[PDB]
Symmetry: C2
Amino acid sequence: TGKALMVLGCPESPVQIPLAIYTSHKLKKKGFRVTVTANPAALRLVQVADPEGIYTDEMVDLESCINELAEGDYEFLAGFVPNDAAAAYLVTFAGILNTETLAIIFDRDADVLEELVNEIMETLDAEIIAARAHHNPAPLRVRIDRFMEEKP
Amino acid sequence: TGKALMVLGCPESPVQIPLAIYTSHKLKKKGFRVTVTANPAALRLVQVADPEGIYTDEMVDLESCINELAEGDYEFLAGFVPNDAAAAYLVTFAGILNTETLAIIFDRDADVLEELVNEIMETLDAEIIAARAHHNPAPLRVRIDRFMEEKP
């Protein structure tokens, strides 16, 4: 019950936006109202992929969200992390929210994933899902389903 | 009252799946029953981006569709064309359906677009929407809205 914030990274990989929507839909089926925060193209991709706004509840540009966010605004935080820039934003958002946090890391290079995994472990108190994926969402979708079966 | 078939190419550009779903929703808004056909990765992206099956009606693998298709099964044909392989598939589907057809050509390189545009013109009797887009769907989205306010 409550509100959830979902942070997206720059969209390069085809699996991101689709998985962002899938994860949001999963959260909504648990009672959460979810807010998506991302750069301009990423938010646009979400808007056209879900033209009627059925899988999402609200959207806000990264900097604007950073400017208005305060502790207690959300009980759940989910961040997609395809790179350094995305990791740093999730860390920032996490420091402000101080709530249940989830990092979803992905890239096709195991080394890059390892670097991203290390970074999140050393900085945040957060559950991690990490998979080598670029075009096939399966690995991540299954692991997200699993996470969702238990953790709110 | 009719049916439309939507053909997708290999998913690389993040604008494809979202725009495919956007276009299908536009068609359903016009009364069409929309069938999406593409490769495994592509179909899986569509399914995770629209987990409730709200924006499309049916989905079938490329080869399976090619194996069951006959003239008259669809009143409209739309094909996304990011490359040569995708253009050849659209040509094949168009030869079988012999109906109102639409090619949505995209790539960031204007030269590549030119070759794809020429190819469709020399091989097909289809309306063409082309744009240099990779991650921002806007150019294509606006051009699709325009086509839709008057064609299918």
